[PDB]
Paper text:
Here, we present a computational protein design strategy to repurpose drug-inhibited protein-protein interactions as OFF- and ON-switches. The designed binders and drug-receptors form chemically-disruptable heterodimers (CDH) which dissociate in the presence of small molecules. Previously, we reported the design of chemically disruptable heterodimers (CDH) from known protein: peptide-motif complexes, by transferring the peptide motif from the disordered binding partner to globular proteins and using the known PPI inhibitor as a chemical disruptor.
We performed a structural search over approximately 11,000 putative protein scaffolds and after the design stage we selected for experimental characterization three designs which we refer to as LD4, LD5 and LD6. Next, we tested if Drug-3 promoted the dissociation of the mdm2:LD6 complex by SPR and determined an IC50 of 106 nM. These results were also confirmed using SEC-MALS where the drug dissociated the complex into two monomers. The structure of the complex closely matched our computational model, with backbone RMSDs of 0.37 Å over the overall structure and 0.24 Å over the p53 motif region. The conformation of key residues observed in the native interface were closely mimicked in the crystal structure of LD6 in complex with mdm2.
Author numbering:
A (entry chain A): 11 to 96
B (entry chain B): 10 to 128
Amino acid sequence: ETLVRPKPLLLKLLKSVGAQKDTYTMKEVLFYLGQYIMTKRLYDEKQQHIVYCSNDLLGDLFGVPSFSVKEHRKIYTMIYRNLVVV
Amino acid sequence: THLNFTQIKTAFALYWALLEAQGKPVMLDLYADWCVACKEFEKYTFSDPQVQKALADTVLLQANVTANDAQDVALLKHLNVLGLPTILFFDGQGQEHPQARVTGFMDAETFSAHLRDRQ
């Protein structure tokens, strides 16, 4: 929704799924993030709402071994912990 | 002329989509060609500009399972869908209200009544 500048790490990931910008809306960041997980297939095929980042940049960036997409707020904070605002 | 729905394939895409909503209520239309009731739904009910406005505050999702491939069946099994048409509703935290499943055809009016049983 509102404009934000991803930190070095969240940018390095974001450029990897075809974002060329340096400044994004929120909905964008969420979108390109979803894509990174689909791309690297970090979700469990059985329980698709479960994401394994331990052993991947996303783990270091969120600082957890795994998480459930079901926990909206937690992920939102883990993201925001890698932005700043215009 | 047609409502604007973002397409989904995997259960992941759905769960990610519910996150991206955060706050907005969500509607999920399962769709297929071989489901006439679905194309009937699309053309007659989602064109109707009364419907369209009752959904303007609501995020709109669509799965196309016409292929009935593995990712299509996993989605359907996980969602516990028995057959099309099926339309699913989510409150703002992304939990489905199963009471408010639609499992049949409805016109513009009946739909807008069922949108008095949403979220």
